[PDB]
Design a protein around this ligand. Structure first.
Ligand SMILES: [K+]
Ligand SMILES: [K+]
Ligand SMILES: [Mg+2]
Ligand SMILES: [Mg+2]
Ligand SMILES: [Mg+2]
Ligand SMILES: [Mg+2]
Ligand SMILES: [Mg+2]
Ligand SMILES: [Mg+2]
Ligand SMILES: [Mg+2]
Ligand SMILES: [Mg+2]
Ligand SMILES: [Mg+2]
Ligand SMILES: [Mg+2]
Ligand SMILES: [Mg+2]
Lengths: 113, 118, 78, 92, 117
RNA sequence: AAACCACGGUAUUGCAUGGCUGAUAUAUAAUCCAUACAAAGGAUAUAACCAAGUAGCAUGGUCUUAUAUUGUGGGCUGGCGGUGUGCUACAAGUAACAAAAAGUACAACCGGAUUAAUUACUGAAAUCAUAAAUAUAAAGAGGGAAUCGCUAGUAAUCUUUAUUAUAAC
RNA sequence: AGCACUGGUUUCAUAAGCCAGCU
């Protein structure tokens, strides 16, 4: 079983497995399964073809997913860079946007864009 | 020519004369706030009243700057020691800095306050 | 019709109670009442500093006297 | 940020500066600004905490940074931000 | 207190009024329904948990069968007593009108005045 | 702002000084906490070599109408390296979630850093304050030489209060 | 790779010694 071309582990619960989709988390994954009539006791290996199709259709209509979500986030960052605001310069430089980070800013340095 | 003598206090409870700095300017701010307190409260109520249309609320916002000085804002007032004028280390319940309060307590000039142990 | 006193809506009871004793103010309202319900502290702030008059009628100015003794106790300037 | 239901903040001094500018250049304000012509002059201000209006479109602002007035020409993408985000105070 | 000549103590103004429901019913000839409605309107006392300070102007105590009213709106001791007495009469008028009962000299005396409302 | 005027100075000398403080810390006590139905442990006080520290305040010498007093914005937070004191974790599932299907999820879905969009709250003013929520879901699998605290209601671990417009690890 | 260098640790401090990183 794969939804949005992400392979869902067979032995895990459906609402737990859907978290692997970029754009769905705990609270939102639970909403999707229950909206389709699936409770927390249903596992991936218990799903059928019709169940998968319902989930895939519901996700596409309500949520932005892996590729479109990544593009949207990047376009937001690029706009700030072109505007040349304070935050935009920090993104271009590859450092955090907080006021005082001369002592602890390592995470923002290794997660550049 | 004109003179402006520094504010100093000579009290029998302390062997030395006590001087202070920059209390007059803060007193001016406290007086100005009391002068404009009534109008400020009225405009605060109107700007946080959801029943009014905003094109009216935006115009009321402009009254905070045209009808009263910036120095009547309550957020720009600080508490200074009444004897020395020091801001840091103030003990609010007595109105004196920790340096003066400790010495006065030792000689019993503060009612009811004494050393503690337990 | 006869309505027993134990079957009266709480809404009507609240309206009667608040109509007599007043309506309390909630924590976060947007009616503009919080500003007008806070007590005024204009006088409490402006009477904080210890500012006795420089010259008290009938008494000597000890601070002025203190300064004069200091000048006499050392050499004159220029 | 500022609560949306309470509106923006704009300084009164900034509004007075723009009103005077409009009176000086009525033709550009009504017609020229939309064809794309550049502003005939710049407005210097200290109001770094004011929000940028689209009625400030084609206007040139000199925003104080501590030493001089840094030129800032308003674009559509700058709408909604403060004037102080486009005038840097520190230099490396 | 030592500062009596320089500031008026804030606790001089508040006053409280207490009345026993059983005696009040007998004096004014209130019916059982009227008494029950009066107790419901008062209700138990409400104290905020942040400060444990009573915030209910009116409350009813079941153990002592007492109806209490607190008045602290004004700065004057007497002005609060006048306010408290008026509020007590307003409650009686409302309960009596909904559930009329027996007539007594006290009720007739109040009716001629109109409950001072 | 002071009239046979007592100008002001966060200017300088702490190696000219007053006052106050760090720095030996056992032992003792008509002192404090607790006690009243059987107990244990603490707190406070107790004279210093160190030219040790001192733009709170006071003071001798020297300097200065103004080295004074004031308005707007900016800075003290600053694209880099070193490192002290703390908080949050991971080896070890004795974890995690929880209103018990006498449970639920997972097999470090343990850990909760960073960034995007959004809203509320305080305030005259919130890009460079705080909180919540949605998405994102980083380092970390017990750590070199070396080094610190403590010896029982103590270490370890958990909750709460106060100093106290908004804002404590 | 490593010698060497580089950063630390130890000492009242210098040196020596020690530990990693790196070529
Ligand atoms: K303990
Ligand atoms: K900390
Ligand atoms: Mg996910
Ligand atoms: Mg100066
Ligand atoms: Mg010395
Ligand atoms: Mg020395
Ligand atoms: Mg020292
Ligand atoms: Mg300033
Ligand atoms: Mg600092
Ligand atoms: Mg573990
Ligand atoms: Mg977890
Ligand atoms: Mg493990
Ligand atoms: Mg890992």
């Amino acid at each position: 079983v794969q939804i949005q071309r992400v392979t869902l582990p067979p032995h895990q619960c459906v609402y737990m497995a859907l978290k692997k989709v970029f754009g769905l988390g705990g609270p939102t994954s639970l909403a999707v399964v229950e909206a389709c009539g699936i409770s927390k006791g249903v596992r991936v290996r218990d799903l059928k073809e019709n169940h998968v199709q319902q989930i895939t259709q519901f996700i596409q209509d309500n949520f932005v997913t892996e590729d479109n979500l990544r593009r949207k986030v990047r376009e937001d960052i690029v706009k700030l860079v072109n505007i040349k605001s304070r935050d935009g310069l920090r993104h271009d430089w590859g450092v955090s946007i907080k006021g005082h980070t001369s002592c602890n800013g390592k995470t923002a340095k290794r997660l550049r864009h | 020519t004109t003179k402006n003598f520094r504010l100093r206090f000579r009290i029998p409870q302390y062997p030395d004369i006590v001087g202070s700095r920059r209390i007059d300017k803060d007193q001016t701010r406290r007086v100005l706030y009391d002068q404009h307190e009534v109008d400020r409260r009225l405009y605060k109520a109107m700007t946080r009243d959801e029943s009014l249309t905003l094109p009216v609320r935006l115009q009321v916002q402009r009254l905070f700057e045209t009808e009263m000085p910036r120095d009547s804002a309550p957020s720009r007032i600080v508490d200074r020691c009444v004897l020395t004028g020091r801001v840091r280390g103030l003990v609010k319940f007595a109105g004196l800095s920790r340096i003066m309060l400790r010495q006065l307590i030792h000689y019993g000039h503060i009612g009811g306050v004494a050393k503690a142990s337990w | 019709s006869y309505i027993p006193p134990s079957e009266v809506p709480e809404e009507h009871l609240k309206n009667i109670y608040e109509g007599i004793f007043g309506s309390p103010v909630a924590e976060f309202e947007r009616t503009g009442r919080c500003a007008l319900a806070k007590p005024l502290i204009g006088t409490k702030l402006s009477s904080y500093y210890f500012l006795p008059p420089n010259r008290q009628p009938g008494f000597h100015n000890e601070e002025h006297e203190y300064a004069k003794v200091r000048l006499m106790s050392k050499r004159q300037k220029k | 940020g500022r609560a949306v239901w309470r509106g923006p903040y704009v300084s009164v001094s900034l509004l007075e500066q723009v009103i005077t500018f409009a009176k000086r250049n009525p033709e550009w304000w009504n017609i020229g600004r939309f064809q794309g012509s550049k502003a005939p002059e710049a407005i210097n201000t200290f109001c770094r905490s004011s929000t940028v209006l689209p009625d400030f479109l084609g206007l040139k602002f000199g925003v104080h940074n501590g030493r001089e007035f840094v030129g800032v020409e308003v674009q559509e993408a700058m709408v909604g931000h403060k004037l102080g985000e486009f005038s840097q105070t520190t230099f490396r | 207190h030592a500062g009596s000549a320089f500031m008026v103590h804030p606790r001089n103004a508040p006053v409280q009024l207490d009345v026993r429901v059983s005696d009040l019913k007998q004096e004014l000839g209130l019916s059982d329904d009227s008494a029950a409605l009066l107790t419901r309107l008062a209700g138990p006392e409400r104290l905020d948990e942040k400060t444990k300070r009573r915030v209910s102007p009116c409350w009813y105590n079941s153990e002592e069968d007492t109806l209490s009213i607190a008045a602290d709106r004004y700065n004057d001791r007497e002005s609060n007593r006048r306010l408290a007495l008026e509020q007590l009469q307003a409650l009686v008028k409302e309960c009596d009108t909904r559930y009329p009962g027996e007539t007594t000299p006290a009720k007739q005396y109040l009716s001629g005045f109109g409950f001072f409302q």
